[PDB]
Enzyme design. Structure first.
Site, PDB file in Angstrom:
ATOM      1  N   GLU A 174       0.836  -1.216   0.000  1.00 38.82           N
ATOM      2  CA  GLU A 174       0.000   0.000   0.000  1.00 38.82           C
ATOM      3  C   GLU A 174       0.863   1.255   0.000  1.00 38.82           C
ATOM      4  O   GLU A 174       1.662   1.444  -0.914  1.00 38.82           O
ATOM      5  CB  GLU A 174      -1.031   0.043   1.143  1.00 38.82           C
ATOM      6  CG  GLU A 174      -2.226  -0.869   0.936  1.00 38.82           C
ATOM      7  CD  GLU A 174      -2.696  -1.568   2.197  1.00 38.82           C
ATOM      8  OE1 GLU A 174      -2.653  -2.818   2.229  1.00 38.82           O
ATOM      9  OE2 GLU A 174      -3.070  -0.870   3.167  1.00 38.82           O
ATOM     10  N   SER A 224      -0.582 -11.832  66.336  1.00 34.79           N
ATOM     11  CA  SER A 224       0.656 -11.390  66.990  1.00 34.79           C
ATOM     12  C   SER A 224       1.362 -10.194  66.352  1.00 34.79           C
ATOM     13  O   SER A 224       2.277  -9.635  66.953  1.00 34.79           O
ATOM     14  CB  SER A 224       1.605 -12.563  67.201  1.00 34.79           C
ATOM     15  OG  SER A 224       0.996 -13.503  68.072  1.00 34.79           O
TER      16      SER A 224
HETATM   17  C1  63V Z   1      -0.040 -14.513  68.018  1.00 32.31           C
HETATM   18  O1  63V Z   1      -0.179 -14.758  66.820  1.00 32.31           O
HETATM   19  C2  63V Z   1       0.088 -15.521  68.956  1.00 32.31           C
HETATM   20  N1  63V Z   1      -1.083 -16.347  68.743  1.00 32.31           N
HETATM   21  C3  63V Z   1      -1.887 -16.956  69.789  1.00 32.31           C
HETATM   22  O2  63V Z   1      -1.610 -16.836  70.960  1.00 32.31           O
HETATM   23  C4  63V Z   1      -3.101 -17.818  69.380  1.00 32.31           C
HETATM   24  C5  63V Z   1      -2.544 -19.159  68.924  1.00 32.31           C
HETATM   25  C6  63V Z   1      -2.574 -19.613  67.621  1.00 32.31           C
HETATM   26  C7  63V Z   1      -1.958 -20.923  67.468  1.00 32.31           C
HETATM   27  C8  63V Z   1      -1.458 -21.442  68.721  1.00 32.31           C
HETATM   28  S1  63V Z   1      -1.794 -20.267  69.965  1.00 32.31           S
HETATM   29  C9  63V Z   1       1.075 -16.582  68.629  1.00 32.31           C
HETATM   30  N2  63V Z   1       2.295 -16.168  68.041  1.00 32.31           N
HETATM   31  C10 63V Z   1       2.846 -17.157  67.247  1.00 32.31           C
HETATM   32  C11 63V Z   1       3.631 -16.658  66.083  1.00 32.31           C
HETATM   33  O3  63V Z   1       3.388 -17.068  64.920  1.00 32.31           O
HETATM   34  O4  63V Z   1       4.515 -15.793  66.298  1.00 32.31           O
HETATM   35  C12 63V Z   1       2.477 -18.521  67.394  1.00 32.31           C
HETATM   36  C13 63V Z   1       3.619 -19.496  67.124  1.00 32.31           C
HETATM   37  C14 63V Z   1       1.776 -18.945  68.578  1.00 32.31           C
HETATM   38  S2  63V Z   1       1.659 -17.727  69.938  1.00 32.31           S
END
Ligand code: 63V
Ligand code: M0E
Length: 649
Positions: free
Chosen positions: A161, A361
């Site tokens: 073209e 946590s």
């Molecule tokens: C915060 O996450 C804290 N969780 C709890 O206390 C509730 C639970 C859940 C599963 C077992 S207890 C926990 N922090 C951690 C982390 O990942 O840093 C966990 C290993 C358990 S304590």
């Protein structure tokens, strides 16, 4: 009746009126072009040879043995040679720059212009075009003037073209032929093809027309129109059986040639464009949008999601598992990467901006940050009671929180430093309650989390705070910057076609918490990664000295990880859309995705620069400050370390 040649002649003058109202002004409603981050290379910058090749490849740069075209690069033993493609930067428009990048270990030494052999103060890298914002017509175009197209591409088109131009511009045979002799007489032959090369239909993106050579070259190859090889130039001309037509164009004009978008991040971009400018943007044509988007961090985060999730699904025997990754700049809050699912290429539900989940946590540092902000009362060596708790709730219930192992320290106490390191629940409540929930809630406000999500009850201290990964990224950025809340942004600038600055970003960081409390919390977060909950990361990357925090909600429904390096704050969430058990923990879930993300790129080591009034102090086994020695050295917020003299007596 010779009158006929007078009414058809007046139609020609009233056709020349229509070819004026269009071509003299707005020819098209050119959609807004979205660009990524504009990286400025500089001498002595911490970037390796391999890290630079990856950065180049991600910015549409092709590795070759000998450079002939822009957007190409060569790899040597201790250097990289590149032709940085022309880019109309908002600061200053630039052209072709043949440059050499010479490296020394993990850092760039010199950026030298290969034309005059001179050093660069800083060298600009052009941004990669992410996407185009959906046009009202549905016709997607990227305007490039005549000169932008190579002479070979023009010749591959001429021939095969003016006749076609009017057909695609004003029509649904004699009418266009009349218009063609009006057009060619009024405008220069070169101006004619400029419009043609930006009008022609070349592709389909869902139900959005991909028309014109510049957008087609990127939509099909992922490289600009200027940097198209003859075989690719032939295919783009030929589209105006698929392999056959490419070779058909090749024979017309050999044997070698005949043988040869971000839905999560764009949600934030479109939301920010609406909030900063309003409905004023969409009307304007050919708008240039400059984002904070990092192609290197994104590709790495996508890879960690696409590979990590099915690997976790097979290991824990899961039928369904999902993720969310938010990468933001440690100091400026600039959003570098966003992943809203295990399928980041194909998505509709962005988990990084919509999945409001219990943080667990990840709520703990707010409590210690509130404590560490009061240096005359709370320090790292501060003893926190670790004994059975029983709190009164309205009316008849008793809240008895437990640590994960349902155990308590033999001595009935722990140091503040260890309590955060191991993520101990019982001492976190004791500390949080002694400070009071309104004090801890105020810290969150300063960290930049949504005010309407804060319910100040004892459960808040443990993780009864439902946030999206982006809101968590804001909170952690504030601690990571050294105690400066930099409101997260996806937008750097919004520029009009006439070069007018519609919107310009400026730093608006706010001092939220003191620098010393933020440092002491960050140094404690380095302990979680090295010796606490995040110990598996610290063993794999000990030289990076990451500051982190794991999250594991009740009944393993959510796994969270908040990772901090020298340059970025990364928030990872791994859980199920049905709010159900994942058989995973913070360390095994979200953190496993962060490691993969760290392995998929080259991260910046975290070297905490201590702020003012920070003194490393020695403590005895009892936790008391000692003048000389001590079995433990902890940083302390003090302008006169003679806290030791007062302690020793
Ligand atoms: C915060 O996450 C804290 N969780 C709890 O206390 C509730 C639970 C859940 C599963 C077992 S207890 C926990 N922090 C951690 C982390 O990942 O840093 C966990 C290993 C358990 S304590
Ligand atoms: O006057 C008439 C005009 O009639 P056309 O048929 O439009 O002209 C074609 O034939 C010419 C000829 N005389 O031989 C020509 C070959 O010179 C034309 O090529 C030119 N002008 O350079 C040729 O026009 C082309 O015709 C294509 C379609 O015609 C197809 O021709 C085949 C063989 O000639 C036939 O077999 C096909 O049956 C016939 O369809 C134009 O492409 C079309 O462009 C449309 C915009 C596309 O529509 C979109 O398609 C999308 C999609 O398919 N998905 C979506 O549906 C979307 O909603 C929709 O809007 C549409 O999908 C797309 N179809 C094809 C086969 O490419 C394409 O856009 C158009 N090219 C230009 C530069 O204007 C004439 O001169 O003949």
């Amino acid at each position: 009746a010779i009158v006929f040649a007078v009414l058809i002649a007046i139609y020609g003058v009233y056709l020349d009126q229509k070819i004026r109202s269009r071509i003299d002004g707005k020819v098209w409603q050119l959609p807004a072009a979205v660009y990524g981050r504009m990286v400025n290379l500089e001498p002595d910058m911490t970037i390796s040879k391999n890290e630079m090749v990856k950065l180049l490849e991600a910015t549409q740069y092709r590795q070759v043995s000998k450079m002939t075209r822009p957007g190409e690069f060569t790899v040597q033993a201790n250097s990289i040679e590149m032709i940085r493609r022309p880019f109309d930067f908002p600061d200053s428009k630039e052209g072709q720059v043949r440059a050499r990048l010479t490296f020394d270990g993990d850092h760039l030494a010199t950026i030298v212009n290969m034309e005059n052999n001179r050093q660069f103060g800083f060298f600009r890298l052009d941004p990669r075009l992410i996407t185009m914002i959906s046009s009202p017509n549905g016709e997607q175009r990227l305007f490039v003037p005549r000169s932008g197209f190579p002479d070979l591409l023009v010749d591959t088109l001429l021939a095969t073209e003016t006749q076609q131009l009017v057909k695609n511009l004003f029509l649904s045979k004699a009418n266009e032929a009349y218009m063609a002799l009006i057009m060619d007489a009024r405008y220069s032959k070169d101006r004619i093809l400029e419009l043609y090369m930006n009008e022609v239909y070349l592709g389909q993106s869902g139900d959005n027309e991909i028309r014109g050579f510049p957008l087609a070259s990127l939509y099909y190859f992922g490289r600009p129109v200027e940097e198209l090889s003859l075989d690719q130039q032939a295919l783009l001309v030929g589209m105006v059986l698929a392999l056959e037509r490419r070779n058909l164009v090749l024979r017309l004009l050999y044997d070698m040639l005949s043988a040869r978008p971000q839905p999560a991040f764009m949600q934030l971009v479109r939301q920010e464009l609406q909030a900063k400018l309003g409905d004023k943007v969409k009307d304007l044509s050919g708008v240039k949008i400059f984002t904070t988007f990092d192609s290197v961090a994104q590709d790495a985060a996508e890879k960690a999601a696409v590979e990590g999730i099915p690997a976790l699904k097979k290991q824990r025997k899961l039928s369904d598992l999902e993720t969310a990754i938010v990468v933001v700049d440690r100091f400026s809050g600039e959003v570098r990467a966003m992943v809203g699912g295990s399928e980041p290429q194909f998505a509709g539900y962005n988990r990084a901006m919509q999945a409001r989940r219990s943080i667990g946590s990840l709520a703990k540092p707010a409590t210690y940050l509130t404590a560490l902000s009061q240096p005359k009362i709370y320090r790292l060596n501060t003893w926190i009671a670790d004994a059975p708790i029983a709190l009164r709730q309205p009316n008849g219930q008793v809240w008895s929180p437990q640590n994960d192992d349902r155990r308590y320290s033999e001595s009935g106490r722990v140091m503040l430093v260890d309590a955060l390191t191991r993520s101990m629940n019982v001492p976190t409540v004791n500390l949080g309650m002694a400070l009071g929930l309104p004090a801890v809630t105020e810290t969150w406000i300063k960290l930049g989390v949504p005010k309407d999500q804060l319910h100040p009850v004892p459960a808040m201290l443990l993780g009864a705070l439902n946030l999206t990964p982006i809101e968590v990224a804001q909170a952690f950025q504030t601690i990571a910057s050294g105690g400066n809340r930099a409101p997260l942004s996806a937008l750097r600038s919004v520029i009009a076609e006439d070069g007018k600055v519609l919107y310009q970003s400026f730093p608006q960081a706010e001092r939220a918490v003191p620098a010393q409390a933020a440092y002491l919390t960050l140094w404690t977060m380095q302990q979680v990664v090295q010796r606490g909950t995040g110990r598996q990361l610290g063993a794999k990357y000990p030289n990076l000295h990451l500051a982190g925090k794991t999250g594991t909600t009740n009944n393993n429904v959510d796994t969270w990880f908040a990772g901090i390096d020298g340059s970025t704050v990364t928030i990872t969430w791994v859980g199920r859309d049905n709010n159900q058990p994942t058989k995973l923990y913070g360390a095994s879930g979200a953190m496993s995705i962060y490691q993969r993300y760290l392995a998929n790129q080259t991260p910046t080591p975290l070297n905490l620069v201590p702020p003012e009034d920070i003194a490393d102090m020695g403590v005895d086994y009892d936790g008391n400050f000692v003048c000389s020695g001590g079995m433990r050295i902890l940083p302390v917020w003090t302008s006169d370390p003679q806290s030791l003299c007062q302690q020793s007596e």
